[PDB]
Ligand code: HEM
Ligand code: HEM
Ligand SMILES: Cc1cc(N)nc(CCc2cccc([C@H](N)Cc3cc(C)cc(N)n3)c2)c1
C-alpha cells in the first residue's frame with residue numbers, strides 16, 4: 122500500500138506544479154523518472170523547482186491562514202543537505218537572521234531532509250524557533266504557560282532559565298540515531314524584541330510587556346507530493362491581534378487585561394462597562410504602535426483582511442477553487458468589521474499543505 | 484409518505500416530552516389517540532402542555548442561541564383559536580405589551596393555528612414585529628437597508644412612511660383566503676424606544692441614535708412533533724452587541740462607525756489606529772448604558788456567555804446532548820474573551836426547533 126500512496130500523490134502534485142510553471146510537456150518524462158525511482162529506492166527526490174513551488178502551494182492551501190496573498194513570494198531555503206547537528210543549528214540560526222532582516226521581515230521556510238520510512242532525520246522540539254519559557258510550581262506562575270511542558274523538558278536536559286517572564290527557550294532538536302536531543306542557547310543578537318508602549322498613555326510602559334519580532338513555526342510537517350518534510354520551519358510577520366488579543370490577553374497565556382485596565386485608567390469591576398473590550402483595543406493599539414516604531418514588520422487585522430480579499434479575488438481570476446477555515450480566518454477582535462465574517466469558506470484539505478504533528482515530549 | 488412523516492415525528496416528540504414531564508406512562512395511550520386522529524383528519528392537535536413544552540424544547544435546541552439558559556421560563560401564549568385578522572392583530576398587539584412589560588422584558592411566544600396541508604392559516608410578513616423601514620432611491624439612503632424590500636411591499640399596499648431613519652413599519656400579515664395582506668400602524672404607546680447616549684461623552688447624543696426595546700422574531704416556523712406553526716412570533720431581550728456591533732455598525736445597516744469616531748474624538752484615517760475597534764467598544768458601551776438607564780432589559784456579551792456556560796453545564800447534568808453553532812454563538816466583539824471561542828460545538832439539528840422560511844414578498 123505505502124508505495125502506491127506515494128506514487129498517487131506524486132502524479133497529482135507534479136502535474137499540478139508543472140502546469141502552473143508552464144512545463145506541462147515535461148510531466149510525462151518526469152513522472153517516468155519518478156516511477157522508476159520509487160520502484161528502486163522506495164521514494165523519490167524533488168527538484169529544487171518542485172520543492173520551492175510545493176512550499177508555496179502549501180502556504181496557499183493553508184485554510185487557517187489570512188496572510189496568503191503573498192504565497193508566491195515565499196523565500197525557500199533548500200537545506201536537504203545537512204547531516205550534522207552543528208549544521209542544523211547553524212541553518213536555524215541563519216533562518217532567524219535572514220527572515221528577520223533587521224525588522225523588514227521576509228517570509229521564509231528552511232527545508233530539512235524528509236522522513237524516510239516515516240523515520241525522521243531531524244526532529245525539532247520547538248513549537249516556534251523563538252519562544253518564551255513558562256514555569257508553574259507552588260502556585261507560582263512565571264512566563265508563558267503555553268510553554269510549560271517544553272520548558273520542563275529542556276530543564277531535564279540540563280538547561281536552566283532565569284525565570285523572568287520572558288526567558289528565551291533554547292533551540293532543542295534530536296537527530297536520527299541520538300536517543301536524546303541537543304539544545305543551544307539562542308544568541309541575543311539574533312533575536313529582535315519589541316517593548317510594548319502606547320501611543321499616548323505613558324503609564325503603559327509600567328507593565329513592562331514585550332514580544333519577539335518574528336513568529337517562526339517549527340512543529341508542522343510540510344507534505345509535498347507524498348514526501349513528508351517533518352522539519353520545515355517557516356515564518357511570516359505577526360498580525361497585531363495574535364500578540365494583543367491572544368498571547369498577552371488570554372487567561373491561559375499572559376493574562377494582562379486587568380493590568381491593562383488599570384494603566385489605561387478604567388475600572389475592571391462591571392461586565393456592562395466592557396472593560397475587557399476596551400483594554401483589548403488599547404493593548405492592540407499598543408502592539409501595533411510599538412512594532413511600527415521599532416521598524417519591525419507587522420500587519421493590523423483590517424489591512425490583513427483587505428489583503429485576504431485580494432487573495433480570494435486572485436484565486437477566482439486564476440480559476441483556482443478557494444479553501445479556508447472561517448473559524449481561524451476571522452480575527453479575535455472586531456471580526457464583524459471584516460468581509461471575512463460575512464461570507465463562508467470551503468474547509469477542504471488540498472495538498473501540498475502544512476499539517477500539525479505529535480510532539481515527542483508529552 | 485406525508486402521513487408517515489407526521490406519525491414518526493409525533494412518536495419521537497411525545498415520548499421525549501412526556502419523559503421530561505414525568506408522564507412516561509401516559510405515552511402509550513396518547514400515541515394511540517394521536518394515531519387514530521391522524522388516521523382520521525390527516526393531522527393531530529397538541530394538548531396545551533405538549534404545546535408549551537414543545538415551544539420550550541424548541542428554544543433549547545436553537546443552536547445559534549446564546550441565551551438558552553432560560554429556556555424553561557418561556558411564557559407561551561396559546562392563540563390557536565384566532566380566525567379573524569382583527570384577532571391576529573390584537574394578539575400581536577398584546578404580545579408586544581405583555582412581553583415588553585414596561586421594560587422588564589418577558590421571553591414570550593404567541594402561537595397561531597398551524598399549517599394544515601402545508602397551507603398557512605396565518606402568514607406574517609414582518610421579519611420582526613417591531614422594525615424600522617428603509618428607503619433607497621436616487622442614491623438617497625434612509626433608514627434600515629435590511630428592511631428595504633418589505634418597506635416597498637408595504638408601500639405597494641398603500642402605507643406611507645415619514646422617511647425618517649426610524650419609521651416603525653406597520654404590522655403586515657395575510658389570512659388564508661385573502662389574496663392580499665392587511666397592514667396596521669403600530670400604536671406608539673405599545674413600543675418602547677431607547678435614545679442612545681454615552682455614560683460620559685456628552686456629544687454622543689448629537690448622533691441622535693435610538694433602537695427599539697424588544698426584538699420579536701416573526702419569520703420563523705416552530706416545528707413541534709410534525710406540526711408546523713409557521714406563525715409563532717417569539718422574543719427575548721437584546722444582547723448589547725446585536726444593536727451596537729451589528730445593527731448600527733454594519734456597512735449594510737446603519738453604518739455609524741465613522742460618525743461615532745467623530746463624536747468620541749478620534750481619527751478615522753488609519754487602520755493601525757484601530758479606530759473602528761475603538762468606536763465599536765464606545766458605541767456598545769453606549770447601548771448598554773442607555774438601556775440600563777431607561778429600565779429596559781438587556782444583557783452584555785460577557786454575562787450572556789457566562790449564562791450560556793451554565794446552560795452547557797446544566798445539559799450535562801441532565802444527560803442531554805448539547806448542540807450549537809459556534810459561528811453564531813461567538814459575539815462579534817471580543818469573542819476570544821468568552822469561553823465559547825475556545826471550545827467547539829456539535830451543530831446537529833434536534834427537534835422541536837425553529838426554522839427559517841421563505842418570505843412571500845421577493
Ligand atoms: C507574511 C505574513 C503572514 C501573516 C500576517 C499570517 C497570518 C496568520 C495568522 C493570523 C494565523 C493564525 C495564527 C493563530 O491564530 O495562531 C496564521 C496561521 C497560519 N499561517 Fe499564516 N501568516 C503569514 C505568513 C505565513 C507563512 C509564510 C506560512 C507558511 C508558509 C503560513 C502558514 C500558516 C499556517 C499553516 C497557519 C496555521 C497554523 C496552525 O494550524 O496552527 N503563514 N497565519
Ligand atoms: C432572553 C434573552 C435572549 C437572548 C439574550 C438571546 C440571544 C440571542 C442572540 C444574540 C442571537 C443571535 C442573533 C443574531 O445574531 O442575529 C440569538 C439567536 C436566536 N435566538 Fe435567542 N436570545 C434570547 C431569547 C430567545 C428566545 C425566547 C428564543 C425563542 C424561543 C430564541 C431563539 C433564538 C433563535 C431561533 C435564534 C436564531 C435566529 C436565526 O437563525 O436567525 N432566543 N439569540
Ligand atoms: C506563519 C505564521 C505567521 C503568523 N503571523 N502567525 C503564525 C501563528 C501560527 C500559530 C502560532 C501559535 C499557535 C498555533 C497553533 N495554535 C498551534 C497548534 C496546536 C495544535 C494542537 C494544532 C494546530 N493546528 N496548531 C499557531 C504563523
Ligand SMILES: Cc1cc(N)nc(CCc2cccc([C@H](N)Cc3cc(C)cc(N)n3)c2)c1
Nearest residue numbers: 550698699700717718719720721722725838839
Ligand atoms: C429571540 C431573539 C433574542 C435576541 N436577543 N435576538 C434575536 C435576533 C434574531 C435575529 C435578528 C435579526 C436577524 C436574524 C437573522 N439574520 C435573520 C435570518 C435570515 C436568514 C436568511 C436565515 C436565518 N436563519 N435568519 C436573526 C432573537
Ligand SMILES: C[C@H](O)[C@H](O)[C@H]1CNc2nc(N)[nH]c(=O)c2N1
Nearest residue numbers: 461462463464465810811812813
Ligand atoms: C455566513 C457567515 O457565517 C455569517 O456572517 C454569520 C456569521 N455568524 C453570525 N453570528 C450572528 N450572531 N449573527 C449573524 O448574522 C452571523 N452571520
Ligand SMILES: C[C@H](O)[C@H](O)[C@H]1CNc2nc(N)[nH]c(=O)c2N1
Nearest residue numbers: 448449450451823824825826827
Ligand atoms: C476550538 C475553537 O475552534 C478554537 O478556539 C479556535 C477558534 N479559532 C481560532 N482562530 C485563531 N486564529 N487561533 C486559534 O487558536 C483559534 N482557536
Ligand SMILES: [Cl-]
Nearest residue numbers: 336363364368
Ligand atoms: Cl504566536
Ligand SMILES: [Cl-]
Nearest residue numbers: 698725726730
Ligand atoms: Cl435585531
